[PDB]
Point group: C4
């Protein structure tokens, strides 16, 4: 029943101001699941009587997946006015027709989802196409398309809060009734799992409906292990579009470095062949990641998205889970595309797979390796390391069994190296290059 | 000519009762091929004159595969009334229009095939959208969508009986004439092969039409070996939708355990990483399996569906057929993804492949193994077993050649173990964990 | 300009007879490229004035690939009559509407391309839907769909003759002008390459248009080596539809046995796991192969279709070309899926690859082998054979270097064995089974 | 604002002449991104008032990807005249209707994008379908379709010049403002990267819009390394269509031989199994390559297209980049499909990978090899060569360490061989065949 929305009509109304002359373009930028269309619909339903004519569209992306762009703009003209479709086999005649016919009128037009600029150029991209008092609202997942246009104001919509999330989930799961004084702990766990994103609340609300308490705990365990693919598909829509390196940057951040320092992240990505100046800016642009106190923290569910995508890959390019380490010991197949590693606690193998993975002869079979992390305290059952291949960019090691680094090691454009081990005599015998740090 | 249908109009009529006031929702839940649309059509054709207006749809799934949901509900309003299409570029205005326009009327509306709840919410999901006396009929393959709605009554439609199946097949194969007193044995074999499911009778009826007796026996042999893919595609439609573990549960049940005990099945699935509380409930929900006397018996054709799907897979994850055992002896490729086994009668190999498969060195190449079944009496040409890898969850062995279990065996969260062998001195030297049984 | 067509209007007219009362169904069955639609159009254009109303469709397959079956039959009613589309969201109401409205009229209706029986049932499948004097023409690639209906007469259309093919090609290549007294030899070679099938003549006619003589010879060489994929796609349309074994039967016939004896072919296919009673009948049914003097001769272009399809396959299951033999000597990859062989002339290897292929140790790496043919006279540089694996079904060997068969050979349900070699003392030492021959 | 276009209206106007009687067909042939539709639109907008009726279409390819050809020509008739759609379920009746109805009128019709001749035949393919004074304009990517028709004149549109490219990019990047006296060097580099092709200017203009100078240099580096896939997709559209050997010819030219001599190129392609008489002619025909001073120079961006396509391939069939050489040293996988090589400067390996690649034992693992180029001066750290496999067609070697060619070398239908080495005693001991040179 539109919970927490009334606080938004004031914010949207304030941006336009409703007393200025001419045309103003406002862009609503979200996250890909947070309330965007519902907010646009609320504004439409409140102010649609002030103008001579108004129109509203949903999911222009799907509309062009079923129809043609010329047809779409054909309907828009026939919606503002009551006239029937006018024949035009050329798009440009239609653009001139919109300019010539509806210039001397005040209208409100809402766009729901756009991804490329020719959409705006063919539909609403102008300044004098509309008369005085007209308002243009464009909803999109990234502000970049808005930036190329002359959008006066923009609004970024954040996730719901604890009280609002609980209220919405309670509304969906129990529309009339109330929990039988035994679901509060489960309520807290479920809502904490999502952390805003009302789409997830809607999906889970319809799932646990007239379901006994016996299935709720199983649902918690499944959600802990499985990403609940239904929401993951809607998030996956935003993933398609990254060209060559943004996927690698996003996968690197999601798999290993979620809340690390920015400067070291840019140093790593620049030294690894990616382009942080472009990749980081556009990833922030598309609301996949956000910067908070010089960190690159993302949403909880987006991390699960990246982890699942990394898992579904025939060559294991990202090993962080313990069982994937076991699968990587086959040999001659998975070594050539390891592209990273993350050693974990050893009380899951019970046969010495962990010691073999970082052994000398195992590391000679891999040739591309950038990230290697070993984070678990030494029990007293470790072995010295020999190879340390000549391709690493990020090094993290716990207690070091060996006396010092091997003499066959070259930094090889290293970036980050911290050693928490308490047994190191000297780092190196001489003074090597250390071009980057 | 709608055989056996007259007994159903009474059952459907009784549920609504036809004398109550307000609106009542009835959900017809079937199996994916049993008569569902035909029953809905019979009810429609019998009671369509009682109401002011009525409408009927087929295969809403396909309709959205060709059109948009907004267009679909646009036609529904234009069907109840004689008015032309009304322009609305937003779905919500259309929902309000249905509520505002057709509230003060009594109508009958039938939905043929739905899969997601937003379909019902956008089309028929309400209580006061329709006037007094309105009836809503929703046909679907699973009652779960009905459960989220306030459906008053539900009806599950079962397969046809022996007499009805024979009558329908005779109608299709010989619409006017009669069998020439030589097809009765073939008639019994063909009808027994299907076992209800009038779709299979329709498919086979049109195939053996003006065909000589010489081809009938060949058809029986082909049907024994081949699953007759045409029907298998319609059943395959229901398979798509299972998220991650329901496919594994269904494949496990179809391949090995069809009529086993429920409790051991849930113990196996819970111990193997799946979620029986969710998977079993939803598989029963989607009418893929049913529970009869604490068993998990399914339909005969669904078993062939699962077996064929398991066969078409580049990594042989399910070996039950004898020739697949031969193909699994290549080595270094099929061992790493064996994920189960089923040894069969040895009078098909004639070269000792069976003894090599369970040999000591063969079992060291496989690391993931949950189910292993060996069911054939010992001729006197067997060999002792050595490895018995440390990953099994289900064990079944015939006469045991070895004296006792190897000392290198750990139960490894075992679940089921029965030994029909008559040569066992002691199970183990000591007392191990045996956490699960 | 419709060459050779006038001889067909008489044949089609004679079948209906044009003086009978009631409704008659005639089915035109072709080959998949021979003139079918053009013949139907000629009959339509000649007799469309005799009836009150008439209609004609093209490529119902494509129409349902873009529209819905309900829409298709909606247009058919609106074509016979001048009335606008009538609303009906259920197909069955539309079928009853056709029966109720157009029963008392005489019409001519032509169907262009159908593949499944529900098309005919929903559109034209009845006897009293049409009034006296109505004619139904159904064009299809296989008579099986006609057989399930009560088609009175059928006509099979064959390829064009030498004179007609030359005339049509000359019309396409030189619509006004004439060859400059130097293209006659090239004309004969090109027309001989196609051998009828006016679609191929149309494709090649538009390709060699205002092209110099220098490119013509290159075109002949390319056509000799390349199958000219454009026509191959139209033929490929018919390939899709074979379920599991018809593809294997067709590939076996195209690759090796084109003009062999029928009885041995059925013996091979029955002994190899296929079903000749079904496969051969339906392949003849779909006009892929035809029987002439107890042979299985096919069209020339269909053989190139099968050969190309066999070539495009990552596992080399059909080796007949000489360079594929070289590619099959890699080892451990191609042996496990050889599924046949055809040794050819040895003056293309010049390094002894041919002798290695049939060597003893090479044949132990293959386990599935049915067809093996060795047809080239012994120069005096051959070696004795040792293994002769225990899976063959068809054997053909030239001059035999060895004295007799190896003692480790079992017939293994052999079917065909002829030996043209002049050096054989005895076939076997004893008397083995020889279950099939 | 249509920069540089005014010089084109005169050229197009001159071809028709605008004073002749009858109908004339003019074909505009471009490159796949150069201004073609905009030029056609300019001519339309200037001369559309002279005729009774006129029509214009865009992207007929997409129109048939969403609609049917019959529907397309249905709209064309309803555009010239004001009448509503006329029912016709057969295309041929529609063609006769166009001939019968609009013959006695003068019209202007523009086709935007065609790929197959039946499009023209069904729409505009005739001479007397239109009255005196009618003009037909057909825009297409290749003149071959025009050649089959009776097109009187053709116009090929070239890329923009330096001044025009700078003006257009400045218009897109700064529509109102001007560069802040610091972007001139960046302007020159960006425009030089594209070299005409206004589509690339449009794409890059919208990307660097209100972007700081810090991101511009990163964009230059990314464009140097990445092909900017957005434009590459539009160019990729033209790639689809080449049948079997044109792709191989194009990949060979793009990867290695861009500005080489024509005659040696045709000799190589003819000797390698391709058909230069067909392949070269049609590649020039489709405006992928052009001939300049007996060279095969292409556009700069098309070379990046070919290089990227060659890179995205699981079997490395084209090794020219230095890191791909490292990836090709795995062994037993990449050797069997090397199909060419290009050795580069050795100050990128620093471990001796280059010497191993051309070593004796490495070359025995490859069996298909046509092109091998080694272009870097000998530092004094090279090794003699032994194998030189018996399959090469093109040889290029720098300073030769060995005394002479190995005695196990056969020319093997060699084509090109130049040796810049200064240490060669004799080419061969005797006189071998040397069939081709
Ligand atoms: N604050 C809220 N109150 C009530 N319902 C909400 C709220 N936020 C979201 N929803 C519901 O959850 C769903 C979320 O989709 P939403 O309307 O946000 O589209 P969207 O996220 O803009 O679409 P996309 O991001 O894919 O373009 C909607 O169906 C909406 O009904
Ligand atoms: N009892 C019956 N009498 C006569 N015909 C039947 C009977 N049952 C099924 N059929 C025929 O067999 C076919 C089975 O399809 P049915 O009408 O059951 O659709 P459905 O199974 O509801 O579709 P789905 O399950 O894919 O949603 C129908 O075409 C119907 O004509
Ligand atoms: N005898 C002929 N005279 C003139 N033209 C012909 C002749 N036979 C075929 N053609 C031309 O060659 C083409 C062959 O296609 P045809 O009309 O035979 O369709 P079809 O083969 O029935 O289609 P399909 O087999 O794919 O269903 C047609 O476009 C037709 O114009
Ligand atoms: N000289 C020019 N002046 C202004 N704008 C141009 C010029 N040339 C191209 N453009 C713009 O760049 C884009 C290039 O596309 P264009 O109009 O050339 O279509 P096209 O290349 O004919 O399409 P295709 O080649 O894919 O069939 C157009 O949108 C056009 O607006
Ligand atoms: Mg939205
Ligand atoms: Mg149904
Ligand atoms: Mg046809
Ligand atoms: Mg264009």
């Amino acid at each position: 029943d539109l919970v927490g929305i009334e606080s938004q009509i004031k914010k949207l109304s304030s941006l336009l101001r409703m007393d200025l002359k001419g045309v103003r373009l406002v862009g609503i930028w979200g996250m890909g699941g947070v309330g965007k269309t519902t907010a646009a619909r609320a504004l439409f339903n409140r102010y649609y009587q002030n103008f001579e004519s108004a129109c509203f569209l949903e999911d222009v992306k799907e509309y062009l997946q079923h129809h043609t762009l010329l047809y779409l703009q054909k309907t828009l003209l026939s919606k503002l006015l009551k006239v029937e479709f006018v024949d035009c086999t050329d798009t440009e005649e239609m653009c001139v027709i919109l300019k010539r016919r509806l210039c001397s009128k005040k209208v409100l037009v809402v766009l729901d989802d756009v991804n490329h600029n020719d959409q705006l150029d063919k539909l609403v991209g102008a300044e004098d196409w509309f008369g005085s008092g007209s308002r243009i609202v464009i909803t999109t997942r990234d502000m970049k398309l808005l930036k190329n246009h002359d959008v006066h104001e923009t609004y970024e919509i954040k996730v719901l809060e604890k009280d609002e999330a609980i209220e919405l989930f309670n509304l969906h799961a129990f529309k009339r009734s109330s929990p039988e004084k035994e679901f509060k702990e489960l309520l807290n766990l479920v809502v904490d799992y999502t952390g805003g994103l009302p789409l997830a609340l809607k999906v889970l609300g319809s799932l646990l409906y007239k379901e006994d308490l016996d299935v709720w705990i199983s649902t918690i365990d499944r959600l802990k292990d499985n990403p609940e693919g239904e929401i993951m598909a809607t998030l996956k829509i935003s993933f398609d579009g990254l060209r060559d390196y943004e996927k690698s940057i996003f996968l690197d951040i999601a798999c290993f470095f979620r809340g690390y320092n920015q400067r070291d992240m840019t140093a790593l990505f620049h030294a690894s062949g990616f382009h942080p100046v472009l990749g980081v800016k556009t990833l922030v642009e598309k609301s996949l990641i956000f910067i908070l106190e010089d960190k690159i923290q993302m949403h909880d569910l987006m991390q699960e998205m990246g982890r699942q995508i990394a898992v579904q890959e025939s060559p294991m390019r990202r090993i962080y889970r313990p069982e994937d380490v076991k699968d990587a010991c086959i040999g001659d197949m998975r070594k050539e595309a390891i592209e990273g590693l993350l050693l974990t606690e050893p009380e899951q193998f019970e046969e010495g797979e962990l010691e073999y993975m970082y052994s000398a002869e195992a590391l000679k079979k891999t040739r591309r390796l950038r990230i290697l992390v070993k984070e678990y305290y030494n029990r007293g059952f470790d072995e010295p390391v020999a190879y340390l291949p000549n391709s690493l960019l990020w090094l993290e090691w716990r207690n070091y069994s060996s006396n010092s680094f091997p003499s066959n090691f070259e930094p090889s454009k290293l970036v980050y190296l911290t050693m928490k081990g308490s047994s190191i005599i000297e780092l190196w015998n001489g003074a090597k290059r250390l071009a980057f740090l």
